Amino acid sequence: SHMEDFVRQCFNPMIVELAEKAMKEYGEDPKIETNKFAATCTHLEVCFMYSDGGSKHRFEIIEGRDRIMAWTVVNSICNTTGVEKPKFLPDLYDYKENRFIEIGVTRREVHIYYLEKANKIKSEKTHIHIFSFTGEEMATKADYTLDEESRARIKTRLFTIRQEMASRSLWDSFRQSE
């Protein structure tokens, strides 16, 4: 398919392999559910740009690790700091603010996905931060964790990926697939 070739020539190889591993590891094949393949790569790259923002060792990356190793690091962070173990695996831990962070990338408005994720949490201790493909963002207690410039970089990247998909006439099915 067109989407698979585009994902491979758009994102960096480390990201593509981690996305492939994470999808097969949960029974989905990147060569078929190509829209979910693009979205796993996007979520991965956004998470890595986020963790790059801030100081050197501010964020402990949870996403991208294998399941049991990811939970190993959460349990370790929990017994280290004293925070409660979330029931669902988050994406980061903020050592500066002492909180796990769930990062989301949606194509249906910051209000809809923020509302869904906040209801999914049902344990309000986990900080939530949503980006969209339209430049908009919404975050818990309006606390956006990073400075304006890092978030603006993430947003720019998201919009460049959106235009690249449309240039290949892939954007439409991708926006309707979420």
Ligand X SMILES: C[C@H](C[C@@H](C[C@H](C[C@@H](C[C@@H](CCN1CCCC1=O)N1CCCC1=O)N1CCCC1=O)N1CCCC1=O)N1CCCC1=O)N1CCCC1=O
49: contact with ligand X by CB under 6 A? yes
Alpha helices, H only, 82-143: 110-121
Binding mask 3-32 for ligand X (x = CB under 6 A): ---------x-x------------------
Residue whose entry in the numeric block shows the structure tokens 């590891």:
25
- What whole-number distance in Å separates Cα of residue 6 and Cα of residue 38? 9
Tell which one of 28, 33, 52, 94 touches ligand X (CB under 6 A). 52
Tell which one of 73, 89, 112, 118 touches ligand QVV (CB under 6 A). 89
- What whole-number distance in Å separates Cα of residue 107 and Cα of residue 122? 23
Q: Are 99 and 59 in contact (CB under 8 A)?
A: no
What, of Mn ion, ligand X, ligand QVV, none, does residue 48 touch, CB below 5 to 8 Å by kind?
ligand X
- Enumerate the active-site residues: 63, 91, 117
Report the nearest approach of ligand QVV to the CB of residue 103 (Å): 6
41: contact with Mn ion by CB under 5 A? no
DSSP state of 83: P
Beta bridge partners of 130: 104, 138
Known binding residue 63? Answer is yes
Q: Are 90 and 102 in contact (CB under 8 A)?
A: yes
Binding site for ligand QVV (CB under 6 A): 22, 26, 39, 43, 89, 91, 102-104
